[PDB]
Ligand binder design. Structure first.
Ligand code: NA
Ligand code: NA
Ligand code: NA
Ligand code: NA
Lengths: 494, 493, 494, 494
């Protein structure tokens, strides 16, 4: 009968996107190891500078300049786990972060304005702790949004209390998907530790095992570690909070105009963060990350929706895969000041590259205005664009079955597979976009001839008006909120 | 001193995107052959059937089903030139089509409706012959549209005259660039040949030694070769005109719901058309094309701005590089009825994949509404998109200079490169979009707060109102004009 | 949430076995190419010598020695179909023979003796057409036997008529699988053509489009094309019958002691056949075959159960894949004069190697005594072996599901997977040997303490007295049976 | 003239068997570093448990559940040697165990029954310390048996004396080949260390330098480390006694039905044991071993003669080579009760797969009845198979001399090589089995139509009587024999 015995067969599952060779990967490494020694990094916080020294570095106390020897970069890289798991309040939302090409998406972070609908026209308005609750609710419904990252700032809590300890409980409550705090504060890290230890009722061990709060720090480009960042890392490590050491460098700005040199300036900064982490607590969960892009040597902005942002995040991932770490990179971002043709493009352009390259986590969903405004319409739109990607990422499955030769034959010359059994079993196999319109001119017209913004906007309302977000336990919540009030109290007592 | 010597070094220039492995490529191939022997392929054209029979196929004269032996696919593929040049009336538009990754873009083709303006809004009219004379004018200006493919059908010529011969002189007339005729007629291929022999002054050599015109054809899925097709090929071969054998299958409709299967069906049809071409005139200029997409088993239509399409065009571009022929795949399309947020995503998703796979020619620029409308506005957007795509395909160039180690050092800790000499030199290195906005909310708002559609629209006007298209010779034009006239004459006959 | 998106992942399905680098392959080819020009092969038949001569072959008529130019070796290898399919009378037995590693099995062909059981022990007596009938029925049951190949000879028809023609109708009659004739006779090739054509109701189109018969010739080692072999090709190619150009060299005998060298001699012999096949009729179905083995300079016999046999088939298989042709090779062959311990080892040693190598068709199933005797018992035992192989060929399927991390987890430390949901969905996943006894000592002895030999013998009997075979149509059989007679009478007429 | 200058050339020496890609290794790895953290590994022994905690391991003191951080796996591995040597009392038996594909064989261990010749038939009688004596004498002779591994138990010592110590000196005196103790005891490791120090005469460095004693232990599936096992690792590690950290999972019982998943469990277990040994003593010679098999939920037992076992070992050998350590896998085992066809087959299946993948040590020779009985006949047989296995691993040597185009010509069309020089010189080159019969039928019948089993029985007999085992210096044996006494004496003091 038909064969069912085959010899070794080499296959390709999904889509492979190559940006470097080892000889090239290594060069980028060497150049960074050089830069790490001259000039080195400016580590402002003294405690961190202390840890660096103890472990073998060369710290210049008058200029706060540390020189990291490759052997530490090496050692650091051996301590770090190649994988850890982000937890949610609903285990179903858990998300894994592991050295590989297993792609996950998260929303933008962190904007200051919100693109809400006013009198017929969408209006850019200043964000507030409440806007955060709405986004959080929305992203709790968006499937492709694995976990939540602080979308906008609680500006209205500015000089009022612990805005940062605020941007913690709000998210944890308006969603059950893991929370990634983009704006942490080195001195208030204990507050996050507490708020979580609170969720798991006074039990710390549990909050270390099932962490629901992770944070992001930023090496100040070029070649500097802010005191805020040093404490975020150190506290992040010791307590058990995953730490994303993401970078924001700009070709022609804080790093070379060339993409390659830029990567170096980035690698150096991010690697010094990761090093500082493992020297504090070996096995500290870390993220080799980046949001680096290029400086528009003209317009006067940080274009975050251009191929460069895409290529770099793409590359950053490949570098993370090379170092054995999980990647969190900029992706699905746009410089469009509105959800129009451009927006859709730049979003698709900056996400597909990093995804095919295997970015363990791409952030930018729902963002607009080069990271200034956050649009909920743009989000659900992006959240759909990802589904398309996840299909494309399916690439081409070549098997005797998928080849379907008999199938081709049964149908014969000049017929259709419509009736056929197989065709019916694969009704869902094809990509079925939630918001994209695949209708005739009639169907569409006889439905309002609405553009995607509108189609999406109508979706924004619906979700908000009915999505069901698993709420935090009655008492537990008041325990957590306790730490927030204590944080505001502490704060006002200048 | 500084080093200036290096041993063996393996580099990666560009962005390498992979879909298959050899073992898998072979697999696809066998299915394609295993199918080429059963059921086979229906060849309605009796002259074709003879050509096939003449070489060793099993031409069942009563059903027309030809059966092609792998060895004939082997000789076919060893005859078809791996590369051939396209010529625009303007030498500076020449476009090399060669088995490999050298990618090029060409506008969409060929719809029946145009998305133009009216009263503050865009409206869907029905294509005409004055439209083609404009689409051609724009594409002549569009710097990422290497050559011209028929945009929309000159409807005001149906039953009036030879719509095709009209659809030939009009384009060639309104664009120095090359012309790829989407809907040519097998019985009039000689008309075209002559319209060209004219431009060159009755010199059928300069007409061969400089194809300023090429054509397309689509085997009828699944596994059929329409009569018009076989003649477009046979004549195209005989006259020495570049023929593009593009498939039109639809997973879940005319081909297996699966892609691998769909590729087999596509491979089957496209190849046969290639074998038929070669057996006609060894060395005939052919293409391994495809517009194959998936039938939306949930909307009762053919989504062509979907990731499904993207993957198919990209896969075809590989099967193309595999056998050894130039590719022409369906990319940069969208099922969006309006140049909105969707247009971007869809256009980008579908153009990217083939662009990165190495499609030798990607077409669909300007399209909209699954392929019924041609927005002059989207065309320009897509053209600015292609530009961005290009910077992308440059990936990361890792060299001792691009790594800029010394640069990082002269600037050092906490400073900028704005000053740096090297940086002042690379001012035109970073991607610079023509339409895409990258300003602040302020700057942009004080512009009118124009969305890309509106902005892309004002660009069209500017182009149509001021683009100087290199005009055909005065007489030369009147000569060709006649070929169209005589053609229309015979028509009314 | 749970990951459902991954990029470029290279995987290995099944088990891969390598024998050569492309350089060694090419090298072997180069020897072969030169050996064809010097000394060249001896084409005993004039018709073929002519055919060769016409396409540009230096043909010395005084010695019949033909020299083949590389470009012809090339032309032919490009003319031979990469794939063709064997047809059984039951479309549910059809077997695909196509370049690659799609492994298939067939019984041995063809011994002169039959090893049966008489007075308690095993008795090796001479075969008779009846035996052929019994083997045919037996194999029509065995799953792993894709198709049937003339197992033994009708030594009783010897002298009474044309045995080879009887050797055609009997097999085609006792089994509805495909029939591969190991002993065709060049002059009678037409008799086969008709029995088949007869079967199809005279329609030759159907006989050519659905070959129910195929045959194998043999280059005469070292470097000779016997007329018998020449006619089989020329006539096979013309009629439309799959021809198997299989070599039978012997290291230390008709080829060097080394194996690399024996492969050259073989390669030279086999290709010369294909050159003929294609030059006769372009596109003729062909098989790159071998059963070459090493000679045991010590024992004076050419062992066909030695590792060298296995090594050689494996190599030939690869050589076929190199030239783009389907392969037919030895394997699953033993030298032991009875189904004992030796038997099982040699069977495996020679079937395992060629199999993991991708041989398109392994033949030798149910054979004993250096290819002299056919063992009804060893055929079922072997058949089951082919199963344990098909399983082994699955190797390790590594996917998110196979890794089944959750599975290991839900079960947890110090527990059993016994009553776990997934375990019960894979109840039939493991290898389930039909003969090989996998019972405790107890359960076995309480079943007669039967060794594999006897246990087999019993399932042999059951299969014969109980297996049904799709009979050929009454009307048709007499038509074919008539072709047999028109040949027997004509044989006697001398 | 004749060339003797050739540019770069890629060659494949032997046969290569693949199973995973790197992406797939990384995959299997992560799942092990995922499991190694959750659930974790239960360490029964507190002394070892302390060692884990000491080195940053999170111990759940109450449940005894140790969570091993990936970095401890990485560090453990960096410490472990990539090679070490096994010594025999006879310098000529020294066996190297090194990361790579250098294959070696050792007898099965450790059954409790000896298949011996009763009244004309084979009987399964319970073993005794004496059995070990002879089995040791047998193996000593078997050239394809690198070193000896306690095959049967000194059953007649249970509840009478220090059995395991009897299972030490006994093997050691009845063979000069290295002895691997399959079942050592955590509280007697010191007796062994002393006994060895005795052979060398006080010099412990000699005992460290030339270990003539190694020992194995088995983690408890799934995810457990019995008290005894832990002590084995620790003591062996501290004394400089190699230690085989061999796992014994069962697909469908203690590990996922799938093999990928099972391997993951195998990995977690076998690694933890490696991590322990290392943390206890950096540089402790160890083994990444396994005998994990499948479990026919049907037959009611775990068959160690199935293709599953075959694949598993192979898979484990690769993993072993992946991590840089030596392998000790199960192979050359059978489920058959009597040495019949099944034996010879199942043995070649389980032994060939690992030999090819390149197991650094394969063990299962001389075994039958799913690991219950130890056949002395099957032993001499398996050993002779390994010879055929060894030839097979020679694959095809492609070279100017091996291709031998001159030789092919020197002989020419239709003439043999038997008379040729190159042939008479290579008379020893082909595989020459000791028991596999390659005689024609006639010669065989004369020999008395003896199967392989009995011809094997006659060989065992011939060996047990006449093979001489090197005498341990009489005096030294006294010293050694003495320490075994102190082992018994002490034993009765409880
Ligand atoms: Na694939
Ligand atoms: Na590059
Ligand atoms: Na696999
Ligand atoms: Na070799």
């Amino acid at each position: 009968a038909k064969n069912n015995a085959v010899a070794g067969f080499n296959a390709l599952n999904g889509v492979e996107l190559n940006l470097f060779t080892t000889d090239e990967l290594k060069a980028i490494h060497y150049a960074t190891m050089e830069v790490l020694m001259d000039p080195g990094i400016q580590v402002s916080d003294p405690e961190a500078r202390q840890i660096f020294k103890e472990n073998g570095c060369e710290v210049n106390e008058k200029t706060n300049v540390v020189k990291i020897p490759e052997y530490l970069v090496r050692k650091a890289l051996q301590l770090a786990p190649s994988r850890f798991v982000l937890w949610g309040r609903d285990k179903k939302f858990n998300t894994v972060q592991e050295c590989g090409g297993k792609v996950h998406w998260t929303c933008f972070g962190t904007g200051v304005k919100v693109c809400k609908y006013q009198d017929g026209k969408y209006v850019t308005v200043d964000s507030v702790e409440k806007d955060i609750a709405d986004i959080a609710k929305l992203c709790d419904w968006a499937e492709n949004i694995d976990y939540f990252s602080l979308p906008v700032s609680a500006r209205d809590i500015a000089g009022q209390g612990a805005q940062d300890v605020h941007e913690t409980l709000t998210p944890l409550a308006n969603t059950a998907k893991h929370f990634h705090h983009i704006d942490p504060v080195g001195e208030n890290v204990e507050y996050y530790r507490d708020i979580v230890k609170a969720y798991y009722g006074g039990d710390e061990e549990e909050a270390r095992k099932k962490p629901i709060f992770s944070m992001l720090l930023c090496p100040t480009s070029p070649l500097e570690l802010s005191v805020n960042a040093c404490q975020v890392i150190i506290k992040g490590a010791r307590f058990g909070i995953p730490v994303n050491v993401l970078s924001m460098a700009m070709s022609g700005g804080s790093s070379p105009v060339y993409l390659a040199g830029t990567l170096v300036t980035h690698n150096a900064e991010v690697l010094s963060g990761i090093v500082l982490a493992q020297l504090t607590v070996p096995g500290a969960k870390v993220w080799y990350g980046s949001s680096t892009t290029t400086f528009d040597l003209k317009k006067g902005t940080a274009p975050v929706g251009s191929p460069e942002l895409g290529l770099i995040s793409a590359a950053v991932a490949k570098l993370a895969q090379f170092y054995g770490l999980p990647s969190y990179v900029a992706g699905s971002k746009s410089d469009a000041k509105v959800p129009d043709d451009q927006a859709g493009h730049e979003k698709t352009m900056t996400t597909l590259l990093p995804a095919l390259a295997g970015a363990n986590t791409i952030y930018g969903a729902g963002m607009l205005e080069l990271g200034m405004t956050f649009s909920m319409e743009q989000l659900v739109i992006d959240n759909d664009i990802f589904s398309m990607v996840k299909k494309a990422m399916q690439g081409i499955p070549v098997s005797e079955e998928t080849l379907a030769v008999e199938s081709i034959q049964k149908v014969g010359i000049g017929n259709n597979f419509l009736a056929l059994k197989q065709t019916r079993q694969l009704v869902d196999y094809p990509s079925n976009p939630m918001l994209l319109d695949r209708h005739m001119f009639g169907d569409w017209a006889a439905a309002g001839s609405k553009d995607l913004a509108t189609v999406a906007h109508e979706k924004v309302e619906d979700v908000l008006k009915n999505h069901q977000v698993t709420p935090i336990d009655a008492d537990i919540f008041k325990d957590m909120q306790a730490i927030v009030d204590k944080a505001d109290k502490a704060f006002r007592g200048m």
